[PDB]
Amino acid sequence: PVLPGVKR
Amino acid sequence: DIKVTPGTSELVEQILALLSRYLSSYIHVLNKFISHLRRVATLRFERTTLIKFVKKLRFYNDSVLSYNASEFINEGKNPGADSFDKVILPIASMFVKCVETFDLLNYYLTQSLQKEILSKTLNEDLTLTAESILAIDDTYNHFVKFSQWMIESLRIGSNLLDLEVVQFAIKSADEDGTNIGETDNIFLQEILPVNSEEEFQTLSAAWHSILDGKLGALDEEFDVVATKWHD
Amino acid sequence: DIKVTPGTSELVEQILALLSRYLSSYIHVLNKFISHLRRVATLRFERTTLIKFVKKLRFYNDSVLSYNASEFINEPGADSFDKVILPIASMFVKCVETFDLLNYYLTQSLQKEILSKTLNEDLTLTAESILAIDDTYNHFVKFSQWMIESLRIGSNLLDLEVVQFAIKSADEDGTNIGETDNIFLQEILPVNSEEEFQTLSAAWHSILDGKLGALDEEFDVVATKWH
């Protein structure tokens, strides 16, 4: 799950 | 700070359109369900509860569709102008109010009502599929995360814009001490600050594609579950 | 006199379904029109008039889709067939006259108002859609006449204005005693049995669905025009 503007 | 660009009005309209499809998808599938509960006398009052929820979603929807972004955005010369986080504040505020409303509707519809139907009807004709429930959560969790993104990236965050589920995940992880900070929970994943509207628009389009994907999958499961209530 | 046969209950539902699609066609396309007149301030009050009409169509539609035909029929001494049809024919008459009022406003009064206020045709109905409006109307009228006349349940309280106007205008003119292209003057043959009604009804069903199908088409292209 790669959400933009979000540091996983 | 960040000042508005000429394309700000359109950006706002696009973001609100996301929420409109979110609401309409619910209004569509619930109007079908409400219309079907009319023949089941034992669920007479659970029907009226859903009606109250739909009316709230309807109002949330025809308010979104009526809002003209260009009316509340002063541009001028690239000043004097409106700060960019000024025009986003009531948008994210709208999302929060709708998201928390969904959180209320989702629980009643996917937990309480489900258990009440099985107890009253003794069968599973009018229950939600396990496939649809996952679509409900998957869509909700991302609209939550997107709402959080609009707020934290522009640093317009406060206790008044906090979503409950995010705040629950934070404190639950703060108690159990979880962990190194891996992390699997999206509510625990930090938000990178935006330094320009040109970056906000780009990242908004990235979310717009993702949220439409979940919304598209949500529409699919509603079609399937509306078929189960055929007659 | 004719007694009801077991399959009458489903015949009734089949007839009401026809009226339900007729209503839903208007309800569907008018919702699009009302949702677009919201952005045109000069047509604010013309929009509220349409909302009133749509609400009325919603009510007629919700009543039809909720009517359990088997709740009002019993079947040696059972229900006479015409007595169970009268409430259906009465419903059609009430809806037709409503359509007549709505059609005139939507086809005549509103179109000339829109031209006068907006100075362009960006919100007007196409000439083809208007033709489908009347052609559907005229055939639903005729079908409403056939149901009433063939079962001999006619009176002054089930007369349609457009029918009675066509008759009086004919007897006053010269196209009275002719075969005439006018469908409103053509005589109705009295149905001899339950089966004959049920067959001719399915024949009307084929025709009226055809008109309704054509009406659905024109409604889709006029909604496009309102982009």
Swiss-Prot record, chain A:
Disulfide bridge map: none
Similarity field: Belongs to the SHE3 family.
Domain of life: Eukaryota
Residue ranges crossing the lipid bilayer per the database entry: none
Chain's role: RNA-binding protein that binds specific mRNAs including the ASH1 mRNA, coding for a repressor of the HO endonuclease. Part of the mRNA localization machinery that restricts accumulation of certain proteins to the bud and in the daughter cell. Required for the delivery of cortical endoplasmic reticulum into the emerging bud.
Subcellular location: Endoplasmic reticulum membrane
Gene designation: SHE3
Protein name per Swiss-Prot or TrEMBL: SWI5-dependent HO expression protein 3
Swiss-Prot record, chain B:
Localisation per UniProt entry: Cytoplasm; Nucleus
Result, substituting residue 112 to Y: Prevents dimerization and RNA-binding
Keywords (A to Z) from UniProt: Cytoplasm, mRNA transport, Nucleus, RNA-binding, Transport
Keyword Ligase: no
GO cellular component: cellular bud tip; cytoplasm; cytosol; nucleus
Result for mutant: residue 122 to Y: Prevents tetramerization
Pfam families assigned to the protein according to its UniProt record, in alphabetical order: She2p
Main localization of the protein described in the UniProt heading: cytoplasm
InterPro entries referenced in this protein's UniProt entry, alphabetically: RNA-bd_She2 (IPR024261), She2_dom_sf (IPR036827)
Phenotype for residue 38 to A: Prevents association with ASH1 and mRNA and leads to its mislocalization
Documented effect of changing residue 39 to A: Prevents association with ASH1 and mRNA and leads to its mislocalization
GO molecular function, one term: mRNA binding
The keyword Membrane is assigned to this record: no
Motif extent (Nuclear localization signal): 10-18
Similarity field: Belongs to the SHE2 family.
More details: Present with 4070 molecules/cell in log phase SD medium.
Assembly with partners or alone: Homodimer and homotetramer. Interacts with LOC1, MYO4, PUF6, SHE3 and with RNA pol II subunits RPO21, SPT4 and SPT5.
Protein name, per record: SWI5-dependent HO expression protein 2
Name of the encoding gene: SHE2
